């Protein structure tokens, strides 16, 4: 297939890495973003956005980004913390009093953020049109009994990171808004990515979204991965795209991740708009532990909220941070290169970071530098 888009002449061989991922016929649609200095430099997409092939990818197109959207919503957090009405170091109940129940009234929001607040996933089971009723959802885990003792051990929270690092965010905006709309206000619209990235499908975008392709257990571990179990076929329902699961179901593309990284990287500025000071990113991004997971069940190195950097698993700066989603689709920065990078598409691949087609696309990168 033919690969459109643009892509500046010293960034050639990037252009080819995304045309490689489709010769070798691992790709049906994708999407890739690269941000230097402040500015998209690598804009490029291509294939279908349907099984059958019939309908080409196009530059507006949208796919569900999995836990790519952990990082959004930790931006949302650093925003606020850059704002002065967060605290980090302050407990989770000082904004949000319910959630001392149940023996966290001394976990802190760096520790929620970090997962290490031990409830990774809800204890009885749910359905998805539980995960759809926000308040709801909210409520219950503020009363949940850990799973192990808050900040002891980390264990991802698959699916509910979104609610609890939202709620947060809402407690100390009033609940005036949704995430998704902070997300949107705070973050995506300034620097122009707001109709490339969203928490919440408006019905009047949903028509973008291309199809999602598919290719003992401790309590926490059992409770994160079966209540619910996702699945690729979920992303390809539009209740699910409507709702606000900032966990796992933000609808974007390679360019809104490479504009909201492009930002991050060039300490808070992407295109002469700042979102956020470079304090702010230094201080979301600090190293809260580097354990063997509860959940992932490999030593993650986690900040408040982003991933950070291991075997460069996002390039040669070991500093380097960002998220990866389940399929393949991920973003992350480097505030050294101010390097930003996005990237998106339906095929998924048995992985929730380090996809080959990223790898690729990385190296590719970096030689351009």
Same mark, same amino acid.
């Given at each position: 297939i033919e690969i459109q888009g643009i892509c500046a002449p010293e960034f050639t061989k990037v252009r080819d890495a995304f045309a490689a991922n489709f010769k070798?016929?691992?790709?049906?649609?994708?999407?890739?973003?690269?941000?230097?200095?402040?500015? !998209?430099?690598?804009?490029?997409?291509?294939?279908?956005?349907?099984?059958?092939?019939?309908?080409?990818?196009?530059?507006?197109?949208?796919? *569900?980004?999995y836990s790519t959207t952990k990082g959004m919503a930790a931006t949302?957090?650093?925003?606020?913390?850059?704002?002065?009405? !967060?605290?980090?170091?302050?407990?989770?109940?000082d904004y949000w009093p319910e959630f001392a129940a149940a023996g966290k009234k001394d976990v802190t929001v760096a520790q929620l953020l970090s997962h290490q607040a031990g409830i990774c996933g809800p204890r009885e089971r749910v359905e998805m049109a539980d995960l759809y009723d926000w308040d709801k959802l909210c409520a219950m885990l503020?009363?949940?009994?850990?799973?192990?003792?808050?900040?002891?051990? *980390?264990?991802? /929270?698959?699916?509910?990171?979104?609610?609890i690092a939202g709620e947060v965010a809402r407690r100390v905006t009033g609940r005036t808004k949704s995430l998704g709309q902070l997300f949107a206000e705070k973050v995506a619209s300034p620097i122009g990515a707001g109709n490339d990235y969203y928490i919440g499908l408006p019905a009047s975008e949903d028509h973008r979204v291309a199809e999602m392709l598919p290719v003992r257990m401790s309590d926490a571990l059992y409770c994160a991965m079966a /209540?619910?179990?996702?699945?690729? /076929?979920?992303? *390809?329902?539009?209740?699910? @795209?409507?709702?606000?699961?900032?966990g796992a179901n933000g609808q974007g593309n390679g360019?809104?991740?490479?504009?909201?990284?492009?930002?991050?990287? *060039?300490?808070?500025?992407?295109?002469?708009? @700042?979102? !956020?000071?470079?304090?702010? !990113?230094?201080?979301?991004?600090?190293?809260?532990?580097? @354990?063997?997971?509860?959940?992932?069940?490999?030593?993650?190195?986690?900040? @408040?909220?982003?991933?950070?950097?291991?075997?460069e698993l996002y390039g040669p700066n070991p500093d380097a941070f960002g998220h990866s989603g389940w399929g393949g689709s991920f973003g992350f920065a480097d505030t050294k290169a101010r390097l930003g990078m996005g990237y998106a598409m339906n095929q998924m691949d048995t992985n929730i970071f380090g996809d080959p087609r990223g790898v690729r696309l990385i190296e590719a990168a970096y030689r351009c530098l």
């Open positions: 070798d016929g691992k790709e049906v649609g994708a999407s890739f973003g690269l941000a230097i200095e402040g500015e !998209i430099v690598v804009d490029l997409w291509g294939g279908f956005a349907d099984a059958g092939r019939s309908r080409p990818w196009r530059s507006d197109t949208l796919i *569900n980004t949302v957090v650093g925003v606020l913390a850059d704002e002065g009405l !967060i605290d980090y170091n302050a407990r989770v109940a503020a009363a949940q009994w850990p799973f192990f003792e808050p900040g002891t051990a *980390n264990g991802y /929270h698959a699916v509910v990171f979104g609610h /209540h619910p179990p996702l699945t690729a /076929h979920i992303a *390809n329902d539009r209740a699910w @795209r409507a709702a606000e699961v900032p360019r809104g991740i490479a504009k909201v990284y492009g930002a991050l990287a *060039n300490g808070g500025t992407l295109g002469g708009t @700042r979102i !956020i000071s470079a304090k702010g !990113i230094a201080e979301m991004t600090r190293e809260e532990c580097f @354990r063997k997971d509860e959940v992932i069940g490999v030593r993650m190195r986690w900040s @408040r909220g982003f991933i950070l950097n291991k075997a």
